[PDB]
Amino acid sequence: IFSHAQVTKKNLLVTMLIDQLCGRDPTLTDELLNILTELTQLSKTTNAKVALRARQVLIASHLPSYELRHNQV
Amino acid sequence: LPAHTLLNTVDVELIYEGVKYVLKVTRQSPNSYVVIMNGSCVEVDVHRLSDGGLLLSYDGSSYTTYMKEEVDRYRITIGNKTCVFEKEEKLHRVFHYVLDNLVNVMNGYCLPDPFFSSKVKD
Amino acid sequence: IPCANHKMHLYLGAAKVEVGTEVTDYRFFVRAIIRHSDLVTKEASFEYLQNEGERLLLEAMDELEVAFNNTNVRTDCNHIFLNFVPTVIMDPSKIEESVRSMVMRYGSRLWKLRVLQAELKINIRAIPIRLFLTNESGYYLDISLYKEVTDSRTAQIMFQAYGDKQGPLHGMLINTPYVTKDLLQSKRFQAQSLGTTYIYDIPEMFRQSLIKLWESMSTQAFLPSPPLPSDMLTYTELVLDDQGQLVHMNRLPGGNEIGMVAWKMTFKSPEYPEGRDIIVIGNDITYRIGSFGPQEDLLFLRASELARAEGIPRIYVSANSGARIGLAEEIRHMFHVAWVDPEDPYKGYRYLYLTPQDYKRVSALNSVHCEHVEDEGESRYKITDIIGKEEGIGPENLRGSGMIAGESSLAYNEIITISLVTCRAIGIGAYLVRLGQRTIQVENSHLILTGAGALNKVLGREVYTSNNQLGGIQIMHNNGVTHCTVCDDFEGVFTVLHWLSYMPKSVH
Amino acid sequence: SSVPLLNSKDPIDRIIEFVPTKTPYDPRWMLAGRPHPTQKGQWLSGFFDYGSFSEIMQPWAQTVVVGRARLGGIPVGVVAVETRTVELSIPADPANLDSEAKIIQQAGQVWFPDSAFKTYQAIKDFNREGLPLMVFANWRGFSGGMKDMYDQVLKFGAYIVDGLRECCQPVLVYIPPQAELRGGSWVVIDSSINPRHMEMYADRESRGSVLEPEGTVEIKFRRKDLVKTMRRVDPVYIHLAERLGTPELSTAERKELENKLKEREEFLIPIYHQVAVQFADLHDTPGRMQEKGVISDILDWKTSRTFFYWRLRRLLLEDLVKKKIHNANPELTDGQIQAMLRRWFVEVEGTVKAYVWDNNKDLAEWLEKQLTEEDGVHSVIEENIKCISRDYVLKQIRSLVQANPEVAMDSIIHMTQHISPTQRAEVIRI
Amino acid sequence: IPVGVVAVETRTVELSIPADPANLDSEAKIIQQAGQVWFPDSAFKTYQAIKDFNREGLPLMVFANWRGFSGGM
Amino acid sequence: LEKQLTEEDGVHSVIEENIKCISRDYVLKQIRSLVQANPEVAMDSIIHMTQHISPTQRAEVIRI
Ligand SMILES: CC(=O)SCCNC(=O)CCNC(=O)[C@H](O)C(C)(C)COP(=O)(O)OP(=O)(O)OC[C@H]1O[C@@H](n2cnc3c(N)ncnc32)[C@H](O)[C@@H]1OP(=O)(O)O
Predict the structure, then answer these.
(1) Among C44, D222, D394, E62, which lies 20 to 30 A Cα-Cα from D22?
(2) Ligand 1 pocket, residue C311 CB under 6 Å
(3) Which residues bind CoA (chain D)?
(4) Which of C461, C434, C459 is nearest to D143 (CA)?
């Protein structure tokens, strides 16, 4: 209960953590994906901040890096 | 019971010779305490003594402190002196330091609202 | 609208109107394009579509939040269009499922941002298909799937459905603009269809009635010169703040976010040439038609408290369908039935249960109570109680009703209370009228408690054919519930003000 | 005076043995009880103390029952509801030779004009007696037929509200088991009509809604919605519909599939209608009411009595000391007074025992001690009351002269005639 | 000066009661009502009028021609 | 009665002066009935009434 009380500050730190874990590296292993999946299933609205950003990662690491297109073209 | 009475913060108002000081007190750990006084934050390493006193490290020097609550006074004894208030670095130690601080944040021991997020990003 | 990351294109359109009436229909539109090579489906093509659409949808929602909250134009139906350029081999049912999940997971935000419609173009195998989605409150998504038919003698393309639920777009050409009235000229018609006036038409009639009153009592009395119709009246709308207190506001009509409206009027009457203040209250028959919710009851209460404090009369214009009912809609969709025999449903059913997959995404909202059970080797959440996350459909409207009931009971014994019945009044809306005790009724209206349909169902035959057999003027005026009968609302208002002609300006 | 209490013979730590059923029952059978159907004696208990229930107006408006009884030896007035059918006998008028006696049918759980008039009269009488009130509600609503709308049912419906709003003693509404309160009957006995005294409770096997299941089904579950439900439940419908929408089959096969679909749509209706009825009944539960905050608690029938004693007694005791506070400072409202009593209680007992407020037995004992004890612990509650009275008198004198300075000179002098010499020195010097 | 008024019928009236469609053996009836006489409904009306007029804050005028109350069965 | 009630800045309503006198006497009787039934506040009652009185009235209070 004591840990759940400060969940907003925990959410801020979690956003800062996710910013540096799956940022400028469009790739995800079979371990990060499970954590992100469980984290996106936090349907309680107080944790929405940590769910939403997590979904971004789940969709963000499937994009071209501009290196393939630039080199080939 | 609801989860907003199990708080980790206490506002303490102490009046000294006519000057009222409103201080905030929270913790970064079971033994690491944070005090806001005059708009400035200070960290104190506090250990509980079996005799009701506290062993404090505030500015590098250690102190043994006691408190006595009167009907309208707070008598704070430090060493052999008393103050009465009226009632209205190597790259691998840094890793462990900041990791313990962040884990404490994850367990619910977080800085106060006006000072939080200014030190955690670092 | 300028925006960072200039691959999204956001627009705010103001409906074209003539040189008379101003613009009321404003609409945010989002147009984005999706660039990638064609997909070779090996059960691995969902990711591109889902991720690109969801990324663009999130960026669109963010920019829509910023633009909508930074301005004041009152948009009603925001729309999104995503064009999936590359070709994908995928059955339309799988596309339905994927877009359903992707949209439902943010239906709450899309509802908050007033996003009601969406259009998604996907090339199949390539034949383009169009997904037209209607996204009302975030529990159900009306998905309509169409293919483009180019088999024509001209350059004209057609929408053609898939047999199941043809929908409105069957035979719509390919490209049609939109515009609506969005308020104030569809609610007028919606009310006039039922035999009453739109609520914000109340003050004008009020003013007009007073003009006739300043004729009527001039054949009794050597009155002063009458005032001008501009000076004969002046009113201030009473709105609710975020706390539940009344704010004295001056704003344009149509801005009610609830089904109740309240005015404080000052006017000049032949009895008091300088000073006459009243409170008027009215139900909006067009907003979830009639029904009393908690905020409607709250406005009623605060308005009556104001009138009692100042000591001035209260008038209530009733056009309602009783308390608001409903059912947890999400649960109404995601529930399954455990038959006694799945192959012969007429042997009975044992229970209604959820699966864990859909249970785990609702239960944190306090919308339902289930018990775990193990049956046929399957783990199941048998439903026991359904609560609903939506506020204003449950027993809280009973708590509200009695509250305002008491207020009426009090208001009768402290100030003057008058009640007017225009279209209908059911349950509480009937009792409220009777608690005012000075009831005016309109012809072709009714005060009822139980419906003719339900009574005939319990009785087993067509005993009653109209509800005016139960609560009409042939029942309510001949038994002593209504004091006076009238043909319309203007006559009712003139009757109200005539009655006030006999009464003091205040309890003091 | 207060209502007189007895050292009754029938206990408070017993349970109710007679349990309301879903089939018809005489409501008296749940107030006093009934003899054992299988023995010759052995009274099956009811809600109140045995032999204490006393009826009035029995042959009038037989769909409703009213009386007086005792709970734990605390006198109460009772209002209950007939679920059996009654037949109303009207005689002929000898002044008209073409007149005839008639027998009208009157179904239970339903208000009629006369039954509502009786309920109103009973409420007013019981209140003016100075009694608390118990109400066992199983009303579905008000009759809407031509006769009853003609015979003025709205009138007495509204008079019920007018009666309940003016009650000055506890009113406890309880929805028994296998009972349901629907809409028009809620709005006339809701606790929000007089919250200072009215309380509502519901069994686990009870129902409340703004409407029954069938009337909601008829509006929310139309034929098209039942069909949309068939679309995802019935395997036969699913097979036929997945086939009919399968493109490029044939014309005749599509025709056959469509006809089979129509046949199944007409066939399956009663079963899916019952499904809709159960999906309607699933949100008429009391847990939803507790969560929404429209009942104070969810009770078991059997233990009910032992609850309603200690609640009721507590309230009575509270109404005593609160009255004294209202006598001390008449300008204090009732929420202020409940909060004040909370404050006094925690102050004198301590914050560790602040949880002993929602414990009706212990708090009733404490209030009994503080009010009934004299020449003893001396009632710190009484000293607090005296202080509030003192402050009120002081504030009143000062508000009086502050609004009327012209009498100040006349006010001082009389107060210099009954004061000490030292107080006179303090008056002169200050 | 505004007043509320209560007066009394001396003419005969005929009270029309309809039939209840819920009962197929029901019939409409015409009852006779002589003036200068109280009936239950006439007295109820008089009471309601008195209360309403009083709570309006009006004076009251009463033109009494009542012989009494009906005593029939 | 119409003249005595509706006339202001005129004959000045001797009826109104009588009403003011009755109000004065009522307030006086009320204060005195209040403290006569509650002497324990008399010392607290006097002091506040020595804060908004004239010096000559203060002399009369002290001497009498
Ligand atoms: C006051 C009490 O405590 S009990 C009273 C509680 N409410 C009721 O009893 C409702 C009475 N029943 C009715 O709604 C009446 O039949 C009417 C006339 C008001 C509505 O019937 P209709 O003329 O068929 O209108 P309809 O039922 O279509 O109403 C429009 C829609 O709003 C919904 N709706 C209707 N009445 C209500 C209501 N009282 N509360 C909430 N929603 C309602 C319906 O689902 C309906 O759906 P649809 O448009 O998809 O068909």
Answers:
(1) D222
(2) no
(3) 220, 222
(4) C459
| Beta bridge partners of residue D121, listed in sequence order | none
What residue has token string 């104001």? C306
Q: What distance separates the 2 farthest-apart alpha carbons in chain E? A: 53
Distance CA C272, CA A1 (A): 65
Interfacial residues of D (vs E; Cβ cutoff 8 Å)? 91, 93-95, 104, 145-147, 150
Indicate the DSSP class of residue D406: G
Read off the tokens for D402: 């502050």
Q: CB–CB of D87/D140 below 8 Å?
A: no
Query: Cα(C423) to centroid of ligand 1, in Å?
Result: 14
Which atom of ligand 1 sits closest to the CA of residue C426?
A: 1
- What residue's CA is closest to ligand 1, atom 25? D219
> Under a CB-based contact definition with an 8 Å cutoff, are residues D134 and D79 in contact?
yes
Q: How far is the CA of C323 from the centre of ligand 1 (A)?
A: 9
Number of residues written out for chain F: 64
Nearest to C445 by CA among C480, C470, C419: C470
| Rounded-to-integer distance, Cα C500 and Cα C416, Å | 9
- State the DSSP code for D370: H
User: Which residue type occupies C40?
Assistant: V
Residue C446, ligand 1, Cβ within 6 A: no
In this structure, what token pair is assigned to residue C55? 């990324």
What is the distance between the alpha carbons of residues C53 and D65, in angstroms, rounded to a whole number? 66
Distances from the Cα of A17 to the Cα of A11, A13, B97, C347, angstroms: 10, 6, 17, 56
Q: Which amino acid is at D184?
A: G
Query: Distance between CA C397 and CA C395 in Å, rounded?
Result: 5
Chain C residues whose CB is inside 8 A of the E44 CB are: 480
Which residue has tokens 């919250």? D195
How many of the other CB atoms lie within 10 Å of CB of D93? 13
Do the annotations mark residue C114 as ligand-binding? Answer: no
Q: Which of C223, C202, C323 is nearest to C273 (CA)?
A: C223
- How many Å from the N-terminal Cα to the C-terminal Cα in chain B? 35
Q: Is the CB of C492 inside a 6 Å radius of any atom of ligand 1?
A: no
Q: How far separated are the first and last CA of chain A, in Å rounded?
A: 57
- Interface touch D419/F43, C-beta < 8 Å: yes
For ligand 1, is residue C110 a contact (CB within 6 Å)? no
Confirm or reject: Cβ of C388 under 6 Å from ligand 1.
no
CA C132 to chain centre: 23
Question: Which method resolved this structure?
Answer: cryo-EM
**Cα–Cα distance between C419 and C66 in angstroms, integer?**
45
Dihedral sign from CA coordinates of B34, B37, B41, B45: negative
Determine contact, residues C134/C116, Cβ cutoff 8 Å: yes
* Ligand 1 site-directed mutation target among C140, C318, C325, most atoms within 8 Å of CB: C325
State which of C285, C287, C289, C423 you would mutate to test the pocket of ligand 1, scoring each by most atoms of that ligand within 8 A of its C-beta: C289
Give resolution in angstroms: 2.7
SS3 C343: coil
Show the tokens assigned to C382.
Answer: 């048998």
